[PDB]
Design an enzyme around this catalytic site. Structure first.
Site, PDB file in Angstrom:
ATOM      1  N   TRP A  52      -6.140 -17.175   1.784  1.00  6.27           N
ATOM      2  CA  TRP A  52      -5.920 -17.716   0.443  1.00  6.27           C
ATOM      3  C   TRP A  52      -5.277 -19.105   0.399  1.00  6.27           C
ATOM      4  O   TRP A  52      -5.779 -19.999  -0.289  1.00  6.27           O
ATOM      5  CB  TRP A  52      -5.135 -16.757  -0.454  1.00  6.27           C
ATOM      6  CG  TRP A  52      -5.742 -15.432  -0.663  1.00  6.27           C
ATOM      7  CD1 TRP A  52      -6.624 -15.070  -1.649  1.00  6.27           C
ATOM      8  CD2 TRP A  52      -5.487 -14.255   0.109  1.00  6.27           C
ATOM      9  NE1 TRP A  52      -6.936 -13.728  -1.528  1.00  6.27           N
ATOM     10  CE2 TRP A  52      -6.250 -13.209  -0.456  1.00  6.27           C
ATOM     11  CE3 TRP A  52      -4.677 -13.978   1.222  1.00  6.27           C
ATOM     12  CZ2 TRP A  52      -6.226 -11.908   0.059  1.00  6.27           C
ATOM     13  CZ3 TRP A  52      -4.661 -12.694   1.741  1.00  6.27           C
ATOM     14  CH2 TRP A  52      -5.431 -11.677   1.161  1.00  6.27           C
TER      15      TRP A  52
ATOM     16  N   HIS B   5       0.819  -1.206   0.000  1.00  5.07           N
ATOM     17  CA  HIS B   5       0.000   0.000   0.000  1.00  5.07           C
ATOM     18  C   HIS B   5       0.868   1.277   0.000  1.00  5.07           C
ATOM     19  O   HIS B   5       0.496   2.307  -0.575  1.00  5.07           O
ATOM     20  CB  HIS B   5      -0.973  -0.024   1.184  1.00  5.07           C
ATOM     21  CG  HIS B   5      -2.153  -0.924   0.981  1.00  5.07           C
ATOM     22  ND1 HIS B   5      -3.414  -0.615   1.443  1.00  5.07           N
ATOM     23  CD2 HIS B   5      -2.266  -2.119   0.355  1.00  5.07           C
ATOM     24  CE1 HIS B   5      -4.246  -1.592   1.132  1.00  5.07           C
ATOM     25  NE2 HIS B   5      -3.575  -2.517   0.468  1.00  5.07           N
TER      26      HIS B   5
ATOM     27  N   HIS C  99      -0.738 -12.705  -2.369  1.00  4.20           N
ATOM     28  CA  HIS C  99      -1.737 -13.425  -1.617  1.00  4.20           C
ATOM     29  C   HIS C  99      -1.334 -14.834  -1.269  1.00  4.20           C
ATOM     30  O   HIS C  99      -2.113 -15.572  -0.698  1.00  4.20           O
ATOM     31  CB  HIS C  99      -3.074 -13.343  -2.321  1.00  4.20           C
ATOM     32  CG  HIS C  99      -3.641 -11.961  -2.331  1.00  4.20           C
ATOM     33  ND1 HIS C  99      -4.616 -11.560  -3.214  1.00  4.20           N
ATOM     34  CD2 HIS C  99      -3.348 -10.878  -1.570  1.00  4.20           C
ATOM     35  CE1 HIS C  99      -4.906 -10.288  -2.991  1.00  4.20           C
ATOM     36  NE2 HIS C  99      -4.154  -9.852  -1.996  1.00  4.20           N
TER      37      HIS C  99
END
Ligand code: HEM
Ligand code: HEM
Ligand SMILES: OC[C@H]1O[C@H](O)[C@H](O)[C@@H](O)[C@@H]1O
Ligand SMILES: OC[C@H]1O[C@H](O)[C@H](O)[C@@H](O)[C@@H]1O
Lengths: 717, 717
Positions: free
Chosen positions: A298, A85, A247
């Site tokens: 995940w 991010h 992920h």
């Protein structure tokens, strides 16, 4: 409305909402910076024990904390998210965003909905920052944490550069028009996304995890992924690599109802110590964490690198479903794989789960082709991901010269816009003199000479530090055929003459000295300016730093450079089509990109005008009677109340300035007149327009010119 | 709403309208200032030929200009008006406004309705500014023009001080809550005016020319006049003098309809060159000028000082009437005096006319008593006016040391808060040492010692430069009995001990050396701080500049000093009643008044807390285990995540901080917690909280203390 105290945010933009905001030219002011002017980060960080640092971060990752306990007892994956991010705001349109300023720690970004929980993430690292003090920036630490996370969970990263300087007030970036979080007033046509933006909604990093506008259709989500990632400089391979690699770690958080989550950091009350999103649901942390509202885990190895993500994705069939907070996710058809995905806090097992956007990678043709390949060939993923990630967190650091510390890899990459290393002895004081002479003798006018040096140097942008006069890229595609640079004009003529002077000098060669084309281009302007300063009774000498080298067209990604083409350069009185705001705001944005202050911006427009740096050598703003002579005539004439200004009858955003006898004496654009019209700019024009002002103008002008000529010169800085 | 580009005014105050604006602590940043750090105005202005300047201004006044031609062929009166509006914004509540920054040339003030036409006035002076360059500020020039105007129309002025430094971006001042020009949301009770304001409406200097809310009742208008002038430091005599003296010159302008006047400067279009209020009525200038809408010509000698104003006011009877633009004015009953008042452009004569506010002077009991006197005694008016005008344009220049150039009069005045000149030799390096020793031996605690120094020095405000530790006014009224300073505490005790050390040293006296009480108070803190630094393993020596002298209670206008009483001092963790915004905004306002940057503000709060500078020696914010020892414990402990913060159950804007075992370990105010909670402040806290931070804290803290100790020391600066 209702006017407030200045201490509480009120000021002049409240009376005239659309006035020029000169404050974009004094962002992050010295007075605001507690370090003092002595401080040299590069110097500090290069004394840092990197191993000690890595060990200290590892210890933080594996030490859970009461106030935000650690999924699977390992913060790593959160730190990866964080770092992503941090870097993921970057956009290619203007080079703004990115992890380079450590901007994630300030508004607006610290309170973006997509950055929920990252406040906690950042806080967790304070113990490390405490220990390293000034030797380590928050900017550097946040992305390094992400890189150590990858390492500690067994993925070997490709390298890492230190050197991001911390800033003390938030960088003012345009994030979209939307007045509400998660709003979308940024599309049109089929699905054309507003430039410069590279997210699909306000307060998102890239795309909606539940698919476009909350609609969980994977084929449709892929179009958004493809587009937003492209605008963050990632192509298809890099994108796929990025998401799967990403992920392969951690999980999402949507344990209970979305509306039990308090207000975000900037709106949080004081006792929260700058931490927002407090949850009244359950303990509100850990076991009960609500971050995104989605509840996917995940892989079955959330804290380990391997191939489960791709295996899980392809090894089941998927059906729509709803998180405990009512969010769209996927889960495995006919209750397959039940209990095989482990719990973050030792609860029972869980079934295979995925985001709508994860399915994009199997459902889109291009993503599938790529990811099916890596299903059978994981060592190809591990390679692509190593590469993408490295690029991701280094995208906005510009020249490789800036990268610091033990871990910078040996190998250079195309998206770093590299330039040959200095391979000879550099010209000294004598050859510089010699060359300057030769350049004036070449019959290239002051105008061409300065026009060119500007065209080269001014391609730079402070945002991601791309562009500049290094590399001599002015003579390669696409720079050599940019409208503003004018190919129809005589740029080729100027290039040729300069190469000739280069060759001549290079045979003559006193010992082992060579001169590059890149240096010669800059030198040329310097010579021209020296000349133009004499022609108005000044003997100034313009400083020059040799060292630039010349890129081949192979070291120059044509497609990548597209984004630096000026659509507007007020300094060259150029304004082509499709800028978002009128000419004068474009000027400010451009000055802001060149890292110039209002004084600097002012003198440059002044000087440039009278040297006829103007595009298509138009007369606009050329308020001098003299040719190619460096004077303040621009300023004196701008302030002449004997001239009366009206918009041209031939309506086209230009203006006529007539005297006492009604003759048009001067013409000029908005970019020119705003200097005599805006009260702050006019204040500056009055300094350089005084009778005593002449030498000071020449000084300040050169100082600025030289600054712009040196913007990309991290190699010597 | 709708978010805009930053270049176009958009930022974070748009997402959280009421967040702390730390930008008030980096107003007018160096990078924005085209002069460079070398520049010394004092040194430039002191080389200026004042006669030449007066001559040059005289020549401007009498040379009419096409684009705004001159009433009666003389611009003097316009310049007077201008200079009055320049000084006229000042208000005693916060010392903000005044002519001292030359703020009139920027937003909002350049476009206040009351400042209509002054744009033209300023522009007319450019020819002068042009000639004097950096040797003359716009701040100095605008008021000097006024003063030269008075001189050239035969009124002898009392003196003039140069030295106002020009600023480059507009000072952000709170002018009221009203979102519309001329609005009034600022009254309550009978007619109580919102503090700090000293105008009746938004965009007015003082009062409404047509009387309160447009209602032409003179007895009523006088109440406003009395009140607003009081808040600009004028009493009854001064006020009367000012208006009468003022209106002895020039005329008003309201020749045709009010709505044919274009938009004000900030909203004007580019070709106007920063001039607003363009008139479509007639020629729009001169003969046809519309400024205020009223059409009064007070005297028959508009460009000459004499007694006509007072004669005309008393020598007729007055009846209501309307200007060509439908404004309330007075005119002479039964067509008396017709044709006797001359026309600005050689038209026919006119009748005697007056503003509603002018009648106030005859109708109010107190003004009448005063003005009837000057009807028969004009030399007393000429004397009072000379004095009020001088005070008017010099009010915000603080210490008389700052006044510059050949025209400063010899005589000092009470409103300048004077202090005795240095009458002895000043203590040198040894006596300083010697006395520091004596002060520690005095058994005054570090806490009292610092509490006091601070109490003295921190009374300063950068706004009008009043206050400070010079004059030793801490021991006189009203400072000695200020709530925040604590008379109930031991201030008296500290004073007495200090006077004693003063006397002792003064007998001992090596040669002709004496020490003042003022210097001793400051010295005290400096010794204390040196002591507290040691008690935590630092041998720092605190610098000290002797020279302060001691005022008598006679030199100290008690009523005047009332306005400097802190109603809030976050540095002493004091907050009394009736501040407009919560504790933390008050902190920022206070810091801004002390000319401190955020780093400076930050280290002071940190140091002051742990030295127990706290008011009523409260524990709030004292995040240290040590007594009277100078450490960064405040910072370290503020960043301790092991502590959990909640509002005290005993609800009172304070907080409890508990550790892992649920015990209250720390308490604190909003002023304390905001440093760990606002992201920009927390960023600074983290610098001083690091493990390597200790020496740098001590350095920066001293540097800041010493800065605040020296704020009023223009006598040595
Ligand atoms: C298609 C683009 C992407 C979308 C839509 C997306 C979405 C999300 C969402 C909704 C979460 C849950 C946040 C939470 O509730 O904790 C998450 C978590 C996470 N994301 Fe992604 N992401 C994307 C790309 C990436 C990339 C490029 C990376 C890194 C290369 C990454 C790494 C992670 C990691 C490691 C977590 C787990 C953090 C934890 O354990 O708390 N994501 N992502
Ligand atoms: C009681 C408060 C005052 C009010 C309400 C007031 C109001 C006005 C108004 C409405 C005008 C006409 C504006 C125009 O059309 O040009 C004016 C003009 C003028 N004022 Fe005052 N005034 C006040 C006090 C003062 C003071 C204290 C001075 C100076 C010491 C002053 C000096 C002047 C001068 C010299 C002009 C003439 C300008 C010209 O000829 O262009 N006034 N005033
Ligand atoms: O001999 C090497 C020199 O000549 C080369 O042809 C390059 O263009 C120049 O940059 C270099 O410095
Ligand atoms: O001696 C009388 C006076 O002179 C001293 O030098 C001090 O400055 C003053 O406070 C004292 O009362």
């Amino acid at each position: 409305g209702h006017m407030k105290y200045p201490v509480e945010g009120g000021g002049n933009q409240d009376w005239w909402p659309n006035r020029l905001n000169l404050k974009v030219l004094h962002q992050n002011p010295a007075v605001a910076d507690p370090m003092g002017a002595a401080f040299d980060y590069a110097a500090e960080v290069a004394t840092i024990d990197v191993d000690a640092l890595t060990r200290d971060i590892e210890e933080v990752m594996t030490t859970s904390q009461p106030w935000w306990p650690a999924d699977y007892g390992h913060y790593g994956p959160l730190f990866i998210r964080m770092a992503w991010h941090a870097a993921g705001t970057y956009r290619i349109h203007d080079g703004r965003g990115g992890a380079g300023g450590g901007m994630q720690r300030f508004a607006p970004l610290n309170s973006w909905p997509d950055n929920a929980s990252l406040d906690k993430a950042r806080r967790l690292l304070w113990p490390v920052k405490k220990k390293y003090g000034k030797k380590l920036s928050w900017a550097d630490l946040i992305v390094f944490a992400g890189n150590c996370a990858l390492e500690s969970m067994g993925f070997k990263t490709f390298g890492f550069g230190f050197g991001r300087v911390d800033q003390w007030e938030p960088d003012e970036v345009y994030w979209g028009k939307e007045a509400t979080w998660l709003g979308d007033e940024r599309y049109s046509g089929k699905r054309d996304l507003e430039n410069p933006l590279a997210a699909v909604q306000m307060g998102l990093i890239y795309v909606n995890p539940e698919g476009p506008n909350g609609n969980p259709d994977p084929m449709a989500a892929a179009v958004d992924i493809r587009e937003t990632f492209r605008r963050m400089a990632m192509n298809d391979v890099e994108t796929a690599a990025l998401i799967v690699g990403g992920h392969t770690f951690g999980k999402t958080h949507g344990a209970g109802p979305a509306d039990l989550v308090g207000p975000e950091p900037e709106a949080a009350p004081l006792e929260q110590m700058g931490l927002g999103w407090k949850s009244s649901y359950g303990t509100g942390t850990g076991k009960d964490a609500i971050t995104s509202g989605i509840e996917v885990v995940w892989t079955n190895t959330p804290t380990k690198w391997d191939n489960s993500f791709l295996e899980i994705l392809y090894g089941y069939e998927w059906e729509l479903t709803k998180s405990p907070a009512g969010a769209w996710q996927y889960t495995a058809k006919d209750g397959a794989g039940a209990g095989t995905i482990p719990d973050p806090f030792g609860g029972p097992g869980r079934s295979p789960t995925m985001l709508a956007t994860d399915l994009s990678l199997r459902v889109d043709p291009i993503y599938e082709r790529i990811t099916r390949r890596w299903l059978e060939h994981p060592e190809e993923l591990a390679d692509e991901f190593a590469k993408a990630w490295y690029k991701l967190i280094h995208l906005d650091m510009g020249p490789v010269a800036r990268y610091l510390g033990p871990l910078v890899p040996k190998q250079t990459l195309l998206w770093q816009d590299p330039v040959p290393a200095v391979s000879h002895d550099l010209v000294g004081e004598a050859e510089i003199a010699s060359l300057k002479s030769q350049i004036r003798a070449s019959g290239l006018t002051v105008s061409q000479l300065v026009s060119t040096a500007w065209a080269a140097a001014s391609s730079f942008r402070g945002s991601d530090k791309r562009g500049g006069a290094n590399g001599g890229r002015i003579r390669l595609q696409p720079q050599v055929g940019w409208e503003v640079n004018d190919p129809d004009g005589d740029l080729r003529k100027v290039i040729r003459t300069l190469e000739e002077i280069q060759e001549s000098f290079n045979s003559a060669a006193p010992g082992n000295i060579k001169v590059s084309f890149a240096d010669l281009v800059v030198l040329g302007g310097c010579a021209a300016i020296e000349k133009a300063a004499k022609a108005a009774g000044h003997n100034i000498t313009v400083p020059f730093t040799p060292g630039r080298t010349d890129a081949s067209q192979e070291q120059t990604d044509v497609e990548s450079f597209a984004v630096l083409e000026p659509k507007a350069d007020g300094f060259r009185n150029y304004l082509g089509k499709g800028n978002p705001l009128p000419a004068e705001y474009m000027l400010l944005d451009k000055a802001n990109l060149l890292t110039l202050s209002a004084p600097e911006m002012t003198v440059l427009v002044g000087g440039l005008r009278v040297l006829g740096a103007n595009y298509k050598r138009l007369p606009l703003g050329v308020f001098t009677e003299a040719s190619e002579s460096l004077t303040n005539d621009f300023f004196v004439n701008l302030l002449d109340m004997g001239i009366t200004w009206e918009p041209s009858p031939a309506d086209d955003g230009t203006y006529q300035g007539k005297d006492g006898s009604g003759k048009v004496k001067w013409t000029g654009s908005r970019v020119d007149l705003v200097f005599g019209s805006n009260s702050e700019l006019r204040a500056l024009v009055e300094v350089y327009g005084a009778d005593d002002a002449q030498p000071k103008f020449v000084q300040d002008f050169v100082a600025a010119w030289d600054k712009v000529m040196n913007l990309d010169r991290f190699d010597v800085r």
